[PDB]
Design a binder for this molecule. Structure first.
Ligand SMILES: O=P(O)(O)OC[C@H]1O[C@@](O)(CO)[C@@H](O)[C@@H]1O
Ligand code: NI
Ligand code: NI
Lengths: 379, 379
C-alpha cells in the first residue's frame, strides 16, 4: 500500500519543509504535500519531530562495519557494507577498490555485477581508486601494484562501464587517450594521488576529468608559484571535489574555504574503512596492516589510510565545525554527489517521481531510520 | 585657476563615465559632470580619449628610478622615487625601509618627516618591513638584524605615528601587547615574513593586524592539515592582502583565486626595487648584486631577486592575465589600498572634495600624464 512519513522537518534539496508529509508508493516518492492534504485513509509513520532528507550518497568507501572490499572481493562484502551504511544514514555508495592486481580488478567487476543484478540504487557502481597513480603520492597504496594505465585493462573497464561509476588516476604520466575512452564510456574520471602541476591537471580536465578525489590529500598543494592540483580544482568550475571531514584528514578552516570557492561542487565522502561502525585495533589493506589510533586510521609510519568517518558524522562536523548551514550540508552529502555521478534524476532529492531513498535523523544527529526503495527500516 | 580634464573615459571608483569631465580647483576635485555642463569660458585639457582614474597608491616600495631607500635614507631619495613613480601612474606610496638597525630606522623616520613636511599626499607614510620578522622566512633580510620587538623601539615607533603608516612583523614569537600598542597609535600592522600557524595568524588579527604583506611570499602556506598564514588570510574578512602581480612572484591563477576569495581586500603592490622605471642591468643591494634581465630581477644563479614591477603594469597584468575587469583592477590599485591605510577620505576616488591625484593612461596602458595635488604634468 501507499504510506506517508509525517511529523518531521523535511529537507527536499530545494526547501526546508514544516508541517508537510512525504507519500511513498512502491519504490518511489509519490508527493510532498502539506499534512492537511493527506488522505484520511492513508497509513502514517510518525517521525516524532525528526529530520527527513534523501539518503546519503558515499562516493568513496573502501570498507566498513568490520569488512574491507579489497580483502573479500564479493557481493556478500558489498552487501555487509550496505547494511552498516544504513546505521549511519548512508543509502547509496560506490564500493571502492584501491590499487591492486588485474585479477582483483576483474573479481570486483564481477562482484559489482553480481550485487547490482540483485539490488538497485544501493551500490551505484565500482570506484576504482588506482592503480594508475603516481608513486610519490601513494599514501597507503601499494608500491607493488601502482602502474601506468595500459590499453588492455582500460578497454576491459570501458567494456564494463555498466558496473563502473568512477576511476581515480594520476594523469601527469599516463596516456590522455585513456581518460577520453573512460569518459566516452560514461565512467567518471577523477584526479587523485597525483604529482601534477596546475598545468597538467588543467590539461586533464580538458581531457574529461570532472572529479577530484579527497581534496588536499595525496595531491600537490597550492603554493605561490605553483597552484598545483589544489589550485587547478579551485580554478576550474566544472570539477567536483570530494573532501573528508573527520577532523583528521583536513583542517576544518580549509573545508570552509573550499566550500566558499567550490559551493555546489564540494562533496562529502567518508573514504571509510573497516573500523567505521566497528570496534577494531587494525585492518588489512592489500597486504598492509592499517591501525586504528584515537579515531584515525594509520599505517606504521603515521600515513593516514582512509578513515572511520560515517556520512551522518560528516554532515554534523560540517554543520558544527565547518560553519555550513544544515540544508547545505545535506546537499553536499546527497544532491551534489548525485549530480557528480549523473544519478540526480533519480536520487538526491525529495520529490515526486524519484526513488524513495531517505534518511531520518534527530537533532543530535542520530539516524533513527532509513527508506530504501520505498522500504522503511528502523535503526 | 580652474580647469577641466576632458574627452576621456573616467573611472571614478564607483562608475565608468563616458562624455564627462572632471573639474580641478587648486588641489581638489571640484566636480565630475557632463561635458555639456562646463562653464563655456573654462580651461579644458583635452585628454584625447585616454582613461582617467585616481592615481595609483603603492603600499610597498623599497626603491625605484635607480635608488634604493635603504641605501640613501634621505628625503632626497623619497623624492627620486616619487618622480619615477609618476612615470608609471603611481602618485602616492609608502617609502619602505627593510629590516635594519635602530639608527637607520631613526633616519628613516626623519627622512619621511622632512619630505612630508614639504609635500603632502605623495609619501603617505613610512612602511617598516621588519626588523621583527622570523629568521626562518627571512628572504633577503639580514640575519644579523632580524630580532624580537622591544619596548624601546616600539615606544619610539608609536611616538612617531604621524609619519609611519605601516609596520610588517612576524607575530608568532613577539609580544601581542606590541601589536596593540602600534594599532592604538594609528599604525597599520601587517603580518609578513612569518612562520605562523593558522592559530597564531588568527591570534594576530585579534590583537589588531589588518594587513598581510605580499601574499604567498615569505609566509606559511595552506596545506591540508595546516591552513597557515595564507589560510588565515583567506578565513578572515577584515584582513587586506597585498599581492605582486608581475607574473614571477605569484602565479596568475593564484591571484585570480585570491581575488575571488578576498575581493575588496586584495591590494596591488609593486614591492619594487631600484630598476623599476630606470635603465639598469644590475644593482648591488646590502651586499648581493642582482641583475635586471628583460624586466626580471635575478641573482647570478637565475633565482628571483626582487621586483621591478610598476603599478600601471600591475593593473595591466591583472586585467590581462588574471582576468579581472579594468574598473575592478583600477580599484585594486587605488581605492582598496586607500581604504587599507585609512586615507579613503581624501584619496583613491574621483569625487567632489577629494584630493586631485589622478593618472591618465591610454588603451595600451601607457601612462600619458598625472595630476598631483591639482598639478597636471605630462609624461
Ligand atoms: O597528502 P596528505 O595530505 O599527506 O594525506 C594523504 C591522504 O590520502 C590517503 O587517504 C590515501 O592513501 C592517505 O595517504 C592520507 O589520508
Ligand atoms: Ni586515497
Ligand atoms: Ni618582503
Amino acid at each position: 500500500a501507499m504510506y506517508a512519513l509525517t511529523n518531521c522537518k523535511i529537507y527536499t534539496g530545494n526547501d526546508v519543509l514544516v508541517k508537510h508529509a512525504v507519500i511513498i508508493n512502491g519504490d518511489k516518492i509519490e508527493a510532498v504535500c502539506p499534512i492537511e492534504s493527506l488522505p484520511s485513509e492513508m497509513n502514517v509513520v510518525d517521525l516524532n519531530g525528526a529530520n527527513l532528507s534523501p539518503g546519503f550518497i558515499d562516493l568513496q568507501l573502501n570498507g566498513c562495519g568490520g569488512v574491507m572490499f579489497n580483502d573479500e572481493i564479493t557481493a556478500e562484502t558489498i552487501d555487509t557494507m550496505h547494511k552498516a551504511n544504513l546505521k549511519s544514514g548512508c543509502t547509496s555508495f560506490l564500493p571502492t577498490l584501491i590499487t591492486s592486481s588485474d585479477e582483483n580488478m576483474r573479481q570486483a567487476i564481477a562482484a559489482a555485477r553480481e550485487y547490482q543484478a540483485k539490488y538497485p540504487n544501493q551500490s551505484l557502481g565500482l570506484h576504482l581508486e588506482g592503480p594508475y597513480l603516481n608513486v610519490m603520492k601513494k599514501g597507503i597504496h601499494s608500491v607493488d601494484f601502482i602502474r601506468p594505465s595500459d590499453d588492455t585493462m582500460i578497454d576491459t573497464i570501458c567494456a564494463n562501464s555498466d558496473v563502473i561509476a568512477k576511476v581515480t588516476l594520476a594523469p601527469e604520466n599516463n596516456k590522455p587517450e585513456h581518460i577520453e575512452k573512460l569518459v566516452k564510456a560514461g565512467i567518471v574520471v577523477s584526479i587523485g594521488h597525483t604529482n601534477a602541476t596546475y598545468s597538467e591537471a588543467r590539461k586533464s580536465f580538458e581531457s574529461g576529468i570532472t572529479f577530484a578525489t579527497h581534496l588536499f590529500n595525496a595531491m600537490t598543494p597550492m603554493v605561490g608559484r605553483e597552484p598545483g592540483v589544489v589550485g587547478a580544482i579551485y580554478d576550474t568550475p566544472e570539477v567536483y571535489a570530494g573532501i573528508i571531514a573527520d577532523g583528521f584528514h583536513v583542517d576544518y578552516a580549509n573545508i570552509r574555504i573550499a566550500h566558499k570557492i567550490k559551493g555546489e561542487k564540494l562533496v562529502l565522502v567518508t573514504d571509510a574503512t573497516a573500523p567505521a561502525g566497528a570496534e577494531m585495533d587494525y585492518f588489512i589493506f592489500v597486504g598492509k596492516k592499517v591501525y586504528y589510533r584515537d579515531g584515525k586510521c594509520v599505517d606504521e609510519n603515521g600515513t593516514l589510510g582512509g578513515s572511520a568517518l560515517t556520512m551522518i558524522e560528516a554532515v554534523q562536523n560540517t554543520v558544527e565545525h565547518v560553519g555550513i548551514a544544515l540544508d547545505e550540508a545535506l546537499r553536499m552529502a546527497t544532491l551534489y554527489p548525485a549530480k557528480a555521478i549523473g544519478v540526480d534524476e533519480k536520487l538526491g532529492r525529495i520529490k515526486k517521481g524519484m526513488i524513495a531513498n531517505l534518511t531520518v535523523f534527530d537533532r543530535d544527529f542520530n539516524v533513527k531510520a532509513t527508506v530504501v526503495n520505498g522500504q522503511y527500516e528502523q535503526n
